[PDB]
Scaffold this active site. Structure first.
Site, PDB file in Angstrom:
ATOM      1  CG  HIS A 130       2.782   3.389  -0.296  1.00 49.40           C
ATOM      2  ND1 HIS A 130       2.012   2.250  -0.375  1.00 49.40           N
ATOM      3  CD2 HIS A 130       2.124   4.229   0.547  1.00 49.40           C
ATOM      4  CE1 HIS A 130       0.934   2.400   0.387  1.00 49.40           C
ATOM      5  NE2 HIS A 130       0.976   3.590   0.957  1.00 49.40           N
ATOM      6  CG  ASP A 171       3.188  -0.630  -1.984  1.00 50.45           C
ATOM      7  OD1 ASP A 171       4.230  -0.274  -1.444  1.00 50.45           O
ATOM      8  OD2 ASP A 171       2.060  -0.083  -1.852  1.00 50.45           O
ATOM      9  CB  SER A 212      -0.347   3.049   3.712  1.00 46.51           C
ATOM     10  OG  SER A 212      -0.984   3.837   2.714  1.00 46.51           O
TER      11      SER A 212
END
Ligand code: 23U
Ligand code: NA
Ligand code: NA
Lengths: 250, 31, 11
Positions: free
Chosen positions: A43, A99, A198
């Site tokens: 992502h 992910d 992230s």
């Protein structure tokens, strides 16, 4: 990172910053797994709901960093990307299942006191350590609170949470390719990943061989450091067959 | 890498960082 | 907010 602390120098020498070329800004964390391969969250690179679809030439990686915003002359190294690889079954539509993404660097990076790769877990290290209550460590330059930004790399140690508690905290469908971590409301300690963390690493230090292993990738959360919510991390071992296939083939 | 996970400024010099013991103390398996 | 990086990396 919320409720963490400043990292020590060289504490996380596999930490990587994903950096946008134009405008120049932090995009995500990442980790160094060899002299030419960097691991991150899918992502960070592809997220259609937010119109995110970065290509190789949009990005740089910055390795060996401590300060968020400074150019750390004679310490950090800046590398261009040869190729991005996203897991072919990354589920950006629903729940960020799988992910994970790899980036191959155009040229190998020289290791140093500040630049050094993390290990990826074998099956047995993963089985031994990915247990509720066992703590890992997250690092990143993301926000210090949900609603602000650090001078230097932040670190927080967080316990892995029992899977039923993870499931019962959320309306998102959780999968075996994820685990969650964080303190419970009653526990008197707190901490979480947040926006900008992230793609960075959740690491554990094996007590069997005294090496650091990357068990997780910072993936998703509902807010940051909310009571009764947890951070969710990509389960690196469960996806290691894909990692190995990409590196062996490319 | 054969040398993965061993930090130049910590494991390679037998120096501990300020909170790694917190991790170790949480690991029951195998002791 | 970020210090400009060297131009060589933006070629
Ligand atoms: N907040 C969303 C999320 O975490 N997202 C959106 C895309 C990128 C990701 C994100 O911001 N990750 C950074 C982060 C923040 C805090 C803790 C961690 Cl560990 C990581 C998340 C989510 C949205 C609504 C309700 C529950 C969960 C989500 C979950 C799955 C799919 C869509 C949205
Ligand atoms: Na639920
Ligand atoms: Na929480």
């Amino acid at each position: 990172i919320v409720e963490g602390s400043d990292a020590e120098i060289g504490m996380s020498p596999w930490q990587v910053m994903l950096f946008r070329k134009s405008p120049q800004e932090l995009l995500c964390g990442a980790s160094l797994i060899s002299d030419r391969w960097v691991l991150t969250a899918a992502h960070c690179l592809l997220y259609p709901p937010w119109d995110k679809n970065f290509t190789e030439n949009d990005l740089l990686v910055r390795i060996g960093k401590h300060s968020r915003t400074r150019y750390e002359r004679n310490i950090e190294k800046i590398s261009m990307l040869e190729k991005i690889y996203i897991h072919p079954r990354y589920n950006w539509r629903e729940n960020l299942d799988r992910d994970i993404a790899l980036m191959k660097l155009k040229k190998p990076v020289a290791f140093s006191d500040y630049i050094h790769p993390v290990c990826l877990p074998d099956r047995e290290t993963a089985a031994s350590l990915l247990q509720a209550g066992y703590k890992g460590r997250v690092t990143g330059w993301g926000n210090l609170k949900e609603t602000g930004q650090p001078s230097v790399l932040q670190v927080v140690n967080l316990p892995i949470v029992e899977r039923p508690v993870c499931k019962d905290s959320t309306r998102i469908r959780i999968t075996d390719n994820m685990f969650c971590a964080g303190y419970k409301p009653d526990e008197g300690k707190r901490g979480d990943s947040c926006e900008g963390d992230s793609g960075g690493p959740f690491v554990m230090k094996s007590p069997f061989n005294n090496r650091w292993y990357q068990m997780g990738i910072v993936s998703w959360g509902e807010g940051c450091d909310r009571d009764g919510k947890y951070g969710f991390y990509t389960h690196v071992f469960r996806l290691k067959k894909w990692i190995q296939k990409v590196i062996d083939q490319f | 890498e054969a040398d993965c996970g061993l930090r130049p400024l910590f494991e390679k010099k037998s120096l501990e960082d300020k909170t790694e013991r917190e991790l170790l103390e949480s690991y029951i398996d195998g002791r | 907010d970020f210090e400009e990086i060297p131009e060589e990396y933006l070629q």
